[PDB]
Amino acid sequence: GYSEDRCSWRGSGLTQEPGSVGQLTLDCTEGAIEWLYPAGALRLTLGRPSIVCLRPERPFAGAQVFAERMTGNLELLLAEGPGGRCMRWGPRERRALFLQATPHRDISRRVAAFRFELHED
Q1: What residue ranges do the domains of the chain occupy?
Q2: What is the C-alpha separation between 47 and 56, in angstroms, rounded?
Q3: Contact 113, 33 (CB under 8 A)
Q4: Which of 6, 17, 23, 26 is most exposed by smallest CB count within 10 Å?
């Protein structure tokens, strides 16, 4: 679950009703996500223009991380296979990441873990 200070989260793919996107809210400027055996999808809301940077912990596998734009469009920040991806949200954009488990042929141990940092550019 959430860490002691609620700036980080660490859970397993068996999060909730299959098909529903689980909901995470983190109101800090710096934190970490550890998604063990990713399954399904998660939406992480991160509570002037803002810049977000993600730093994966290698090996990173089992999921992709997208940034939700006001357009409803998505921007891939972190993906599986072959250090840092940044992106900028507008002043009025909801700061939301979408974590989507990748379809693995095997059900084995994969961990999608990353750190995030928010900057007021």
Answers
A1: 9-105
A2: 20
A3: yes
A4: 17
